[PDB]
Structures are given as structure tokens and as C-alpha cells.
């Protein structure tokens, strides 16, 4: 039947079959409902697309073509919801946001 | 005959070429993206597993994934994630 993939059926770029296999072997439940991997892959693809678009915008404002961990750190830390989602996450080589307290400035 | 290890690099690159079809990504940023995807997968799967356990059910359905997404993500983020998941599931079911 030509073996069309489940990700192409769902209109997704993330692997629905690999997500289903990881759900099966991850010791999460006895069974997986066969629409759970599709939903999950869609959510993961949406989050990845949002972070990648914000990081690419930060790279564009930095006049850069290639996304580095600094751009990812800037994208996550400059957003309320993303920073709350990754509040306890340390990004290697991401640095910190530029922030000096107003009392420290001269005069 | 070293083992093969899998990652989300090609899918992250596909998403990046969809949202920014000129921008590249470094290998360190790809490792960061892989860690982010694995962490979010583990969080959502663990929450869905606990949700299915609390209700005496032995199957993790899309409803458990949707409730876990609503619990774990913040507000607008969870709303758009729920919309994307519902659209993906509806398009998948309407196929074939």
C-alpha cells in the first residue's frame, strides 16, 4: 500500500511512529491510545517551531544567520510563558540577559 | 560496529527550515533543542501517565495528553498547543 507514514497523515514533521515507540517503551502506561502520539508529536512540533522562530528572530536582530545557544537563551528568557516553562533549566553557553539594576548606574 | 543513537536533529531542522528558510543552526544549539524536546516529552508523558493512573485507566489516550498539556504549559502556550494537537488528531483521523 506504498507505506505512507503517520506523520505525513497528521501533517506533522515530528515522527509520530517514534513518539509512539517511545511512549510504548517508556513505562508510562499499559497501552497507548494511537492518537496520543499524534497529539504529542503535534505539541512538541509546535513548541519547537515557536522556540526556533523566536531564536531565528533574535539571530536576525543580531545580524546573524546561524542560531547559537545564546539566541535560544535570549528567546526563552525574553518571554513570560517560555521562561516560566523552562524556569529551572540551564542552557549551556546561553549566557544571561543584560540587566543592570537602576540604582547601580552613575548619578 | 558502534551502536546507532537517535535524536530529533532532522525533525528540528525540518521545522527550522519551515519557520526560517534561510537560517541555520549550530551543533550546540541542536543539542539544546534535543534536550528541550526530550525534557518536554518526559514531562508530558509522565503527567499523562499519572493522569491515567489516577482514574484507574490502563491506556494513555489523546485526552490524557491534552489534560497534561493544559496542566504543564502556561496559558496562551497551552491554548495554542491544544489547538495544534486537536488539529493534528482531526487531520489524522480524517485521513485514510
Amino acid at each position, epitope marked *: 500500500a506504498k507505506a505512507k507514514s503517520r506523520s505525513s497523515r497528521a501533517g506533522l514533521q515530528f515522527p509520530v511512529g517514534r513518539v509512539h515507540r517511545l511512549l510504548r517503551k517508556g513505562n508510562y502506561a499499559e497501552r497507548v491510545g494511537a492518537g496520543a502520539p499524534v497529539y504529542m508529536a503535534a505539541v512538541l512540533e509546535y513548541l519547537t517551531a*515557536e522556540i526556533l522562530e523566536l531564536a531565528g528572530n533574535a539571530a536576525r536582530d543580531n545580524k546573524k544567520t546561524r542560531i547559537i545557544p545564546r539566541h535560544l537563551q535570549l528567546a526563552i528568557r525574553n*518571554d513570560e*510563558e517560555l521562561n516560566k516553562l523552562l524556569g529551572k533549566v540551564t542552557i549551556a553557553q546561553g549566557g544571561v540577559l543584560p540587566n543592570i539594576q537602576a540604582v547601580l548606574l552613575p548619578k | 560496529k558502534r551502536s546507532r543513537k537517535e535524536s530529533y536533529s532532522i525533525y528540528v531542522y525540518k521545522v527550522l527550515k519551515q519557520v526560517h528558510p534561510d537560517t541555520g543552526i549550530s551543533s550546540k544549539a541542536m543539542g539544546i533543542m534535543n534536550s528541550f524536546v526530550n525534557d518536554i516529552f518526559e514531562r508530558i508523558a509522565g503527567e499523562a501517565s499519572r493522569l491515567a493512573h489516577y482514574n484507574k485507566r490502563s491506556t494513555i489516550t489523546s485526552r490524557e495528553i491534552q489534560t497534561a498539556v493544559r496542566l504543564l504549559l*502556561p*496559558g*496562551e*502556550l497551552a491554548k495554542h498547543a491544544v489547538s495544534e494537537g486537536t488539529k493534528a488528531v482531526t487531520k489524522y483521523t480524517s485521513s485514510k
Partner: single-chain antibody
Amino acid sequence: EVQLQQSGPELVEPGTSVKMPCKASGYTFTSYTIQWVKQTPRQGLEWIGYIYPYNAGTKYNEKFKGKATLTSDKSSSTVYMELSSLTSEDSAVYYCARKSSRLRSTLDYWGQGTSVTVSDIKMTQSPSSMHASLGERVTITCKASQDIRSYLSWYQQKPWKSPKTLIYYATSLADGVPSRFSGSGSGQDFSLTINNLESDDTATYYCLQHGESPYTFGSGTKLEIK
């Protein structure tokens, strides 16, 4: 639940500056940017700028750079707009709306809009005004100068009223909008379809793109019923 209170009308002499507040309630204040838009009868709506109260990060339109200044007050949950060196061409209605920091979200809730009277990418809507009776199909087009991935919203505005969000992301229905309205298209071609007309459908319909740095509105299309 969500509302954006605004001040009364301003009758201002030229050469001065004006504060307009955008006191907000019903939602977490720091998690949503506040957008400021100006509307005139001559040239419709222009996106003035926005401010993000989470880090106080602002971004203004190029033509409005310097003329308008946005400030935040997290204690009172208020956003203030400074218009400096007012001329006679600035007598217009200034609306403030809420927009999430998500790229897909659009300007969903709008304020009353203060009427101040002093003593890129091009959106093109094909039908300037359409005449329709109670029960036919309605279609409007929003051809775009450049490519915007699906970052187009459709708004409806009654006379002397703030605009209402109908469609966001070029297909999704806004919160509380009926399923009668529909959006379609992508890239540079977008369309809004109204299924069957009510008496309340008489209004002006605008299309806004937020896929690039200066947000641009359409020319707007007038619709009336019988």
C-alpha cells in the same frame, strides 16, 4: 473578564503632549503585550507600537518613532502613551489592545479608544464596500504585498465602537465568535467568508498582518444588510 479601560476624549492645543492610559484588568498583566493603534477617517488604522510589561520592552512603528512613547506601571497595571508635539493631523481615535507574546496570537481584546482632537508590507482588500441582503454569501480578500505565513487576522468594527476580533492565524475563530464566520488562505492570499447575514453584520471589516516588524492593516470593507 478581560477589559482595557481608557480615558475620555482629549481636546488639546497643538505643540503639547498627552498621556493616554490603558488600565487593564481580568488577566495576568505581565504576560501580554499592549499594542497601541491609531485610527483616522482619512487613512484608516495604523499600528503605532507595543510595549511588553514583563521586561518593559517596547517597539514602535517607524513613522511613529519619537512621536509616541510607551510606558508601563506594573503596580497599577497600566500602560501610558505619550504623544509629543501634537499637530492638527493627529486628531484621531487611539485604541489600545492586548496581544499575547505568542507569534500566532493576535490583538484579541480592545479598549474604548480615546478621541484626541487638536485645535513595508501592503494589505489590499479587493471590495471597498459590498451590498448584501439578509441571506447570501459574503467574501472579502486581503491580498498581501509580501509573504506572511498565515499571520493574518480579521476584525469587525461597528461605528463609534472598538474593533472586534473575528479570525486569528487566518483560519482560527476568535473566542466567542460564531462558526458562521470563516477564514481561508495562506501566504499572500487570504479571504474571509460570512455565511448568512444578520442585521448586526453591518460594519467595517479590516485585515491585519502581524508577520513582520511594522504591523499593517487593510483598507477595510464596508458591509450593510438590506
